[PDB]
């Protein structure tokens, strides 16, 4: 218990030095929750987020837990939230989202310390601390009344991203990675198609998109199903297609190495597969 005690000495007295290390305030965090010091965790998480408002690790970190003691409203509230604190940065909004197709894996697998950063707060000359609330009244109003696996909420913190000042092709590429996991969902489909297709509207010839544009058939896919190969031949036929077009085939074929290194990671791969996906990476 002594050593309870002379731990949070170290870390308090760290952060006291040096309040900007924000590993030094997460790894407090971490030993709080340990301990099972949840009001001193509470008490950690406010001075944090205090003085390190923009930062998605915090943010998350407060969301996913509260997530994980299974309420999803304190889960969303603090990731709106932060959200719309956290907008130079992809970080928060990809969380938000994975956070939110976790909870659809839940339901589809079933089928006070703690102050936060006022996002209306404002500074010494009247603007604001935080960008206007992600969802208006009415459309969260119409996001709850939507039905549970649509998934129209994580497609929504992806059209809202869209108006964030982090949003580019990377972010975009990034959202469909959070999303290219979840693989085993009925709204992925949709999902995944609506980012690749949004992408492919605003970023017509950009290595990331040619990416997602490549990487997509195989989202919903195992192996071994005969779906895979059907899906690989059509992969790679992006990729043929994404070689020959007018593009940065440097970050292309990095992405793309990548990629392929991913899948050939796998076991029980076939081999005629496992040589020529090798022959086309060596071919990059």
Same mark, same amino acid.
């Given at each position: 218990?002594?050593?309870?005690?002379?731990?949070?000495?170290?870390?308090?007295?760290?952060?006291?030095?040096?309040?900007?290390?924000?590993?030094?305030?997460?790894?407090?965090?971490?030993?709080?929750?340990?301990? @099972?010091?949840?009001?001193?965790?509470?008490?950690?998480?406010?001075?944090?987020?205090?003085?390190?408002?923009? $930062?998605?690790?915090?943010?998350?970190?407060?969301?996913?837990?509260?997530?994980? $003691?299974?309420?999803?409203?304190?889960?969303?509230?603090?990731?709106?939230?932060?959200?719309? *604190?956290?907008?130079?940065?992809?970080?928060?909004?990809?969380?938000?989202?994975?956070?939110?197709?976790?909870?659809?894996?839940?339901?589809?697998? !079933? @089928?006070?310390?703690?102050?936060?950063?006022?996002?209306?707060?404002?500074?010494?000359?009247?603007?604001?601390?935080?960008?206007?609330?992600?969802?208006?009244?009415?459309?969260?109003?119409?996001?709850?009344?939507?039905?549970?696996?649509?998934?129209?909420?994580?497609?929504?913190?992806?059209?809202?991203?869209?108006?964030?000042?982090?949003?580019?092709?990377?972010?975009?590429?990034?959202?469909?990675?959070? *999303?290219?996991?979840?693989?085993?969902?009925?709204?992925?489909?949709?999902?995944?198609?609506?980012?690749?297709?949004?992408?492919?509207?605003?970023?017509? $010839?950009?290595?990331?998109?040619?990416?997602?544009?490549?990487?997509?058939?195989?989202?919903?896919?195992?192996?071994?199903?005969?779906?895979?190969? @059907?899906?690989?031949?059509?992969?790679?036929?992006?990729?043929?297609?994404?070689?020959?077009?007018?593009?940065?085939?440097?970050?292309?074929?990095?992405?793309?190495?990548?990629?392929?290194?991913?899948?050939?990671?796998?076991? @029980?791969?076939?081999?005629?597969?496992?040589?020529?996906?090798?022959?086309? !990476?060596?071919?990059?």
């Amino acid at each position: 218990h002594a050593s309870q005690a002379r731990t949070f000495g170290i870390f308090e007295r760290a952060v006291l030095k040096h309040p900007g290390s924000i590993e030094l305030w997460l790894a407090y965090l971490e030993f709080a929750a340990q301990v @099972k010091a949840t009001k001193r965790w509470r008490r950690i998480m406010t001075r944090a987020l205090r003085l390190h408002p923009m $930062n998605a690790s915090l943010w998350t970190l407060a969301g996913r837990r509260a997530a994980q $003691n299974g309420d999803m409203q304190r889960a969303r509230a603090h990731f709106l939230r932060g959200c719309r *604190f956290c907008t130079r940065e992809p970080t928060l909004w990809l969380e938000y989202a994975r956070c939110e197709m976790d909870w659809l894996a839940r339901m589809e697998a !079933k @089928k006070d310390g703690l102050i936060l950063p006022d996002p209306d707060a404002e500074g010494t000359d009247g603007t604001k601390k935080a960008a206007k609330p992600v969802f208006d009244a009415e459309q969260t109003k119409k996001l709850e009344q939507s039905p549970a696996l649509s998934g129209a909420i994580p497609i929504a913190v992806f059209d809202v991203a869209r108006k964030q000042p982090f949003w580019g092709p990377a972010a975009a590429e990034k959202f469909f990675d959070v *999303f290219a996991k979840f693989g085993h969902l009925s709204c992925h489909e949709r999902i995944i198609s609506h980012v690749v297709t949004t992408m492919q509207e605003l970023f017509p $010839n950009h290595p990331c998109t040619w990416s997602v544009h490549i990487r997509q058939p195989l989202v919903g896919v195992d192996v071994l199903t005969p779906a895979f190969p @059907k899906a690989l031949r059509e992969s790679l036929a992006r990729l043929k297609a994404a070689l020959q077009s007018t593009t940065d085939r440097k970050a292309l074929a990095t992405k793309m190495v990548a990629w392929m290194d991913g899948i050939l990671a796998i076991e @029980k791969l076939d081999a005629a597969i496992r040589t020529v996906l090798e022959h086309t !990476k060596r071919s990059l």
